[PDB]
Design a protein around this ligand. Structure first.
Ligand SMILES: FC(F)(F)c1ccc(-c2onc3ccc(-c4nnn[nH]4)cc23)cc1
Length: 237
């Protein structure tokens, strides 16, 4: 992800088939002639899409130009959470399924995985960051405290941002409870709150494994529900 001062990010297409799949997802949802009620509502929860972009002198080099969801913040606190019980898709080989489950074997049980976070600490005017090994090290016993960390600014727990996050997720959940045409594997929620403010973003990202479906995305729903439950518990801290 390249942050551009114009308030967008450039995301390089991942190798095939993942990159091409994510391109077609954005093209389907943001089709200018789309009047599918499900897809028009879905746009509310995604980064705005500005189309495919490539460097003037390098048409081979494909990017997605997306809204930078962090742009309007002064000191954005950012957390990426992968949602679902399965981070492998319906076309995964036994090898790939094993590869994916082993990356985080607790995915089925918890329904979400923290990919990383960047948290502003007020007292030091500095950031603390966690990488993929943080979330992959969390268990049922430690997930509540693991998520809580995102919302602690060194001084206090930001229950305002926690409650706001629940309210934003509930709208995404409602979208999922009212559609049976897409299932999302290995996709994420991007959480942003103001570290230096009640303003909160929660947006769906990373669509390299979104597939047409005839059923509720039950894995995604389980994950959202569990994540909401954890956030709800944190409000009692
Ligand atoms: F923490 C960082 F590194 F500073 C960071 C991470 C993600 C973003 C970010 O802001 N808007 C996005 C929109 C989409 C994505 C994205 N899509 N797929 N993978 N990441 C990422 C986005 C911005 C900053």
């Amino acid at each position: 992800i390249l942050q551009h001062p114009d308030g967008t990010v450039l995301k390089q297409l991942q190798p095939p088939p993942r990159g091409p799949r994510e391109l077609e997802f954005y093209n389907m949802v943001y089709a200018a002639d789309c009047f599918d009620g499900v897809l028009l509502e879905l746009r509310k929860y995604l980064p705005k899409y500005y189309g495919i972009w490539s460097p003037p002198t390098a048409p081979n080099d494909l990017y997605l130009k997306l809204e930078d969801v962090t742009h309007k913040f002064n000191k954005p606190c950012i957390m990426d959470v992968k949602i679902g019980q399965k981070s492998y898709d319906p076309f995964a080989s036994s090898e790939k399924i094993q590869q994916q489950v082993s990356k985080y074997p607790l995915m089925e049980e918890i329904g979400f995985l923290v990919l990383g976070m960047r948290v502003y600490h007020v007292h030091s005017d500095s950031y603390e960051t966690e990488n993929q090994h943080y979330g992959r090290s969390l268990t049922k016993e430690t997930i509540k405290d693991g998520v809580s960390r995102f919302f602690h600014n060194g001084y206090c727990l930001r229950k305002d941002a926690v409650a706001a996050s629940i309210q934003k997720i509930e709208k995404i959940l409602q979208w999922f409870e009212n559609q049976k045409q897409l299932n999302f594997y290995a996709s994420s929620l991007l959480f942003v709150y103001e570290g230096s403010g009640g303003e909160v973003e929660v947006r769906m990202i990373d669509f390299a494994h979104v597939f047409p479906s005839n059923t509720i995305d039950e894995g995604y729903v389980y994950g959202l529900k569990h994540l909401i439950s954890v956030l709800r518990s944190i409000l009692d801290n």
